[PDB]
């Protein structure tokens, strides 16, 4: 259930990060072109935080970005409700 | 319950802020290197707001950032549902 949700998320993050650097390399001045930093990007997105060090300049990138948002926000939300119950049912 | 949640959050914020400046000092051009500003960082993150004045440049930093996100979003969410009921059960 919750371990499924984390995994799903840790999938989406590893999915997006992968596709983004792929999606992005070739576009001169792309920042979002190494999996490491493409990961930070992918976390910061699914958390709905939006720092702005990093983002897609390419279309295909942003198409990634959207899935990453859609899939990753929800799947993170799960881990956010997950630990919200765990503190609820306890104290 | 709610006072537990606030505390948890005010812990996470004081946790993250601490670790971040720790995590970050040494990295030339780190911004996120004084607890005061490392705090603002840590709030702005747990609120899922993402202004972008501040963020971790270091790996270890971002590792902090993640916990801060995970722990701090949820634990803030609590204080957000907390006062959402308090206005609900009242008016």
């Amino acid at each position, epitope marked *: 259930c919750a371990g499924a949700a984390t995994v799903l998320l840790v999938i989406v993050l590893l999915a997006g990060s992968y596709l983004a650097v792929l999606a992005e390399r*070739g576009a*001169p001045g792309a920042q979002l*072109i190494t999996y490491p930093r493409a990961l930070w990007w992918s976390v910061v997105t699914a958390t709905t935080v939006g720092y702005g060090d990093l983002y897609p300049v390419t279309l295909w990138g942003r198409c990634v970005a959207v899935v990453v948002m859609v899939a990753g926000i929800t799947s993170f939300g799960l881990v956010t409700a997950a630990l919200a119950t765990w503190f609820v049912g306890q104290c | 319950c709610a006072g537990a949640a606030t505390v948890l959050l005010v812990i996470v914020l004081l946790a993250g802020s601490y670790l971040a400046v720790l995590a970050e000092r040494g990295a*030339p051009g780190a911004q996120l290197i004084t607890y005061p500003r490392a705090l603002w960082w840590s709030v702005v993150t747990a609120t899922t707001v993402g202004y972008g004045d501040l963020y971790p*440049v270091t790996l270890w930093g971002r590792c902090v950032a993640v916990v801060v996100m995970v722990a701090g979003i949820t634990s803030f969410g609590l204080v957000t549902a907390a006062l959402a009921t308090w206005f609900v059960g009242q008016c």
Partner: antibody
Amino acid sequence: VQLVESGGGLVQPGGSLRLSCAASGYTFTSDWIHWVRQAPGKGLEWIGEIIPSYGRANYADSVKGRFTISADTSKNTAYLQMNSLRAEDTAVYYCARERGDGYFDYWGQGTLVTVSS
Amino acid sequence: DIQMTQSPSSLSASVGDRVTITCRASQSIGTDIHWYQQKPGKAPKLLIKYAESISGVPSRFSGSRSGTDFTLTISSLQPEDFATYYCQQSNRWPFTFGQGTKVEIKR
């Protein structure tokens, strides 16, 4: 883990020639093989990259869409199709593994492609 | 594109002397520059990464500083250090290398 290049010697101006980077050691799903170059007594020239996984293969404006980069995961190789060759293409051509980290961990011996009439 | 300007081209520094090689990036490139020893006829060999050290690289080789000025230093120049030294962007697409710096051992 090391990279083994094949092909390349002499062509005529406007000729064609095909370079090879056989893989040969622990090789992950998602590595880019890259192509770098050095003219007689010059610097290094990033030229291309290719994920053999989805087979998408970015090039230098400097080397245009004159050269193509081929993948073939079945031979754990990658290749540097080399059309429309110029006196300048005269150089040595190292391939290189880059794990998505953006430095070159290993380097194929590098061959000499010469171009004169 | 991004312009690593290595400095200088030529060094005639004496063995066991302190040797330092500068790479001014055109913009702030994060910490995303790597060093590469390449010896006459051989392939580049990666010395430093993230401006961090690689398995098997000699201790004399360290790489520092930030902003636009990145520095690879050879504390105590060796006889086996006669080479050309290279500099690599990663921050923006595409990657770039520095003009390169040739070291010549004096004796």
